[PDB]
Protein backbone atom coordinates (compact mmCIF):
# COMPACT_ATOMS: atom_id res chain seq x y z
CA UNK A 1 0.00 0.00 0.00
CA UNK A 2 0.98 3.62 -0.51
CA UNK A 3 3.06 5.87 1.76
CA UNK A 4 1.16 6.74 4.93
CA UNK A 5 1.53 7.20 8.67
CA UNK A 6 1.31 4.05 10.84
CA UNK A 7 0.81 3.70 14.61
CA UNK A 8 3.80 3.20 16.91
CA UNK A 9 3.68 3.66 20.65
CA UNK A 10 7.11 3.76 22.29
CA UNK A 11 6.78 2.42 25.81
CA UNK A 12 9.89 3.18 27.81
CA UNK A 13 9.70 0.17 30.13
CA UNK A 14 9.41 -2.10 27.11
CA UNK A 15 12.60 -0.68 25.50
CA UNK A 16 14.35 -0.57 28.89
CA UNK A 17 14.59 3.21 29.31
CA UNK A 18 12.41 3.54 32.41
CA UNK A 19 15.53 3.83 34.59
CA UNK A 20 16.58 7.15 33.02
CA UNK A 21 13.36 8.63 31.57
CA UNK A 22 11.16 9.39 34.58
CA UNK A 23 8.22 10.79 32.52
CA UNK A 24 6.29 10.21 30.43
CA UNK A 25 5.98 6.39 30.58
CA UNK A 26 5.85 6.37 26.74
CA UNK A 27 4.43 8.28 23.79
CA UNK A 28 2.91 7.83 20.34
CA UNK A 29 5.80 8.32 17.93
CA UNK A 30 4.23 6.82 14.76
CA UNK A 31 6.25 5.92 11.68
CA UNK A 32 5.97 6.34 7.90
CA UNK A 33 5.87 3.46 5.46
CA UNK A 34 4.58 2.48 2.07
CA UNK A 35 5.07 2.79 -1.67
CA UNK A 36 5.74 6.05 -3.52
CA UNK A 37 3.93 5.30 -6.82
CA UNK A 38 3.62 7.30 -10.03
CA UNK A 39 2.10 9.77 -9.93
CA UNK A 40 2.78 11.24 -6.45
CA UNK A 41 -0.56 12.57 -5.26
CA UNK A 42 -1.12 15.85 -3.40
CA UNK A 43 -1.19 14.33 0.12
CA UNK A 44 2.34 12.89 -0.42
CA UNK A 45 3.81 16.39 -0.17
CA UNK A 46 6.61 15.42 -2.61
CA UNK A 47 9.61 17.50 -3.68
CA UNK A 48 10.37 18.18 -7.30
CA UNK A 49 13.36 15.87 -6.84
CA UNK A 50 11.18 13.00 -5.62
CA UNK A 51 8.84 13.54 -8.59
CA UNK A 52 11.75 13.46 -11.04
CA UNK A 53 13.29 10.45 -9.32
CA UNK A 54 9.90 8.65 -9.53
CA UNK A 55 9.83 9.31 -13.27
CA UNK A 56 13.43 8.16 -13.70
CA UNK A 57 12.70 4.93 -11.86
CA UNK A 58 9.83 4.30 -14.30
CA UNK A 59 12.32 4.53 -17.22
CA UNK A 60 15.31 2.86 -15.57
CA UNK A 61 14.49 0.64 -12.65
CA UNK A 62 18.13 0.63 -11.44
CA UNK A 63 17.34 4.04 -9.92
CA UNK A 64 15.30 3.51 -6.73
CA UNK A 65 11.92 4.93 -5.98
CA UNK A 66 11.47 7.84 -3.57
CA UNK A 67 11.02 6.91 0.08
CA UNK A 68 8.14 7.40 2.47
CA UNK A 69 9.44 9.46 5.43
CA UNK A 70 8.19 11.95 8.01
CA UNK A 71 7.63 15.41 6.45
CA UNK A 72 6.36 17.11 9.59
CA UNK A 73 7.41 16.29 13.16
CA UNK A 74 6.43 17.70 16.56
CA UNK A 75 8.20 17.80 19.91
CA UNK A 76 7.62 16.20 23.30
CA UNK A 77 8.81 17.17 26.78
CA UNK A 78 10.46 14.56 29.00
CA UNK A 79 11.82 14.39 32.52
CA UNK A 80 15.08 12.46 32.72
CA UNK A 81 17.69 11.38 35.27
CA UNK A 82 20.97 13.10 34.40
CA UNK A 83 24.58 11.90 34.80
CA UNK A 84 24.23 13.00 38.45
CA UNK A 85 20.83 11.83 39.74
CA UNK A 86 19.36 15.25 38.93
CA UNK A 87 15.80 15.31 37.53
CA UNK A 88 15.64 17.67 34.57
CA UNK A 89 13.04 18.84 32.04
CA UNK A 90 14.00 18.79 28.36
CA UNK A 91 12.09 19.61 25.19
CA UNK A 92 12.89 17.00 22.56
CA UNK A 93 12.26 18.22 19.02
CA UNK A 94 11.26 16.05 16.10
CA UNK A 95 9.94 13.13 18.18
CA UNK A 96 6.46 12.59 16.74
CA UNK A 97 5.37 12.06 13.15
CA UNK A 98 2.57 14.44 12.17
CA UNK A 99 2.69 13.71 8.45
CA UNK A 100 4.44 11.48 5.93
CA UNK A 101 5.45 11.97 2.34
CA UNK A 102 7.65 10.83 -0.51
CA UNK A 103 11.20 12.25 -0.60
Amino acid sequence: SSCKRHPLYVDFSDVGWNDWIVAPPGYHAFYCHGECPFPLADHLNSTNHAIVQTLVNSVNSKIPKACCVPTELSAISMLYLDENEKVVLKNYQDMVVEGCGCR
Partner: protein, 89 residues
Protein backbone atom coordinates in the same frame (compact mmCIF):
# COMPACT_ATOMS: atom_id res chain seq x y z
CA UNK B 1 -1.50 28.76 -2.39
CA UNK B 2 -4.67 27.31 -0.92
CA UNK B 3 -6.37 24.30 -2.49
CA UNK B 4 -9.37 25.52 -4.56
CA UNK B 5 -10.09 22.50 -6.70
CA UNK B 6 -12.14 19.42 -5.85
CA UNK B 7 -11.37 16.09 -7.55
CA UNK B 8 -12.57 12.53 -7.71
CA UNK B 9 -10.13 10.05 -6.23
CA UNK B 10 -9.75 6.29 -6.57
CA UNK B 11 -6.68 4.33 -5.57
CA UNK B 12 -4.92 7.60 -4.71
CA UNK B 13 -7.31 8.98 -2.09
CA UNK B 14 -5.74 10.75 0.90
CA UNK B 15 -6.40 9.07 4.26
CA UNK B 16 -9.17 11.56 5.00
CA UNK B 17 -11.00 11.70 1.68
CA UNK B 18 -14.81 11.99 1.96
CA UNK B 19 -17.49 10.16 -0.22
CA UNK B 20 -14.51 9.67 -2.75
CA UNK B 21 -13.13 13.27 -3.25
CA UNK B 22 -9.98 15.26 -2.43
CA UNK B 23 -8.91 18.90 -2.68
CA UNK B 24 -5.84 20.45 -4.23
CA UNK B 25 -4.20 23.60 -5.56
CA UNK B 26 -2.96 21.73 -8.62
CA UNK B 27 -4.83 19.35 -10.93
CA UNK B 28 -7.22 16.43 -10.98
CA UNK B 29 -5.77 13.36 -12.76
CA UNK B 30 -6.91 10.01 -14.10
CA UNK B 31 -4.34 7.40 -15.06
CA UNK B 32 -4.70 4.12 -16.94
CA UNK B 33 -1.79 1.72 -16.42
CA UNK B 34 -0.82 -1.80 -17.39
CA UNK B 35 1.37 -3.70 -14.93
CA UNK B 36 4.12 -6.35 -15.21
CA UNK B 37 1.55 -9.00 -16.04
CA UNK B 38 -0.67 -7.29 -18.61
CA UNK B 39 -3.28 -6.29 -16.04
CA UNK B 40 -4.72 -2.81 -16.57
CA UNK B 41 -6.10 -0.59 -13.83
CA UNK B 42 -7.66 2.86 -13.69
CA UNK B 43 -6.98 5.27 -10.84
CA UNK B 44 -7.51 8.96 -10.13
CA UNK B 45 -6.82 11.70 -7.60
CA UNK B 46 -5.38 15.14 -6.85
CA UNK B 47 -1.94 16.32 -7.81
CA UNK B 48 -0.39 19.33 -6.10
CA UNK B 49 0.72 22.24 -8.30
CA UNK B 50 4.48 22.02 -7.60
CA UNK B 51 6.04 19.47 -9.98
CA UNK B 52 2.75 18.96 -11.79
CA UNK B 53 4.23 19.84 -15.17
CA UNK B 54 6.55 16.81 -14.89
CA UNK B 55 3.81 14.43 -13.75
CA UNK B 56 1.10 15.54 -16.16
CA UNK B 57 3.56 15.26 -19.04
CA UNK B 58 4.97 11.91 -17.89
CA UNK B 59 7.78 10.13 -19.78
CA UNK B 60 7.06 8.34 -23.07
CA UNK B 61 10.05 6.14 -22.15
CA UNK B 62 8.32 4.61 -19.10
CA UNK B 63 8.89 0.82 -19.16
CA UNK B 64 5.20 0.03 -18.62
CA UNK B 65 2.30 1.26 -20.74
CA UNK B 66 0.39 4.06 -19.01
CA UNK B 67 -1.47 7.28 -19.85
CA UNK B 68 -2.08 10.06 -17.31
CA UNK B 69 -4.39 12.99 -18.08
CA UNK B 70 -4.80 16.10 -15.93
CA UNK B 71 -7.54 18.69 -15.81
CA UNK B 72 -8.46 21.74 -13.71
CA UNK B 73 -12.31 22.12 -13.33
CA UNK B 74 -13.93 20.53 -10.24
CA UNK B 75 -14.35 16.74 -10.49
CA UNK B 76 -13.23 16.90 -14.09
CA UNK B 77 -11.55 13.50 -13.66
CA UNK B 78 -14.90 11.89 -12.65
CA UNK B 79 -15.51 9.87 -15.77
CA UNK B 80 -12.10 10.38 -17.34
CA UNK B 81 -10.97 7.15 -18.97
CA UNK B 82 -7.66 7.56 -20.86
CA UNK B 83 -6.45 5.33 -23.79
CA UNK B 84 -3.22 3.28 -23.43
CA UNK B 85 -0.24 4.15 -25.72
CA UNK B 86 -0.24 1.65 -28.55
CA UNK B 87 1.63 -1.66 -28.05
CA UNK B 88 5.07 -1.00 -29.66
CA UNK B 89 5.70 -3.38 -32.54
Amino acid sequence: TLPFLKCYCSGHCPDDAINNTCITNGHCFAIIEEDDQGETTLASGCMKYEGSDFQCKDSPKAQLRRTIECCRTNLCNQYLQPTLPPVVI
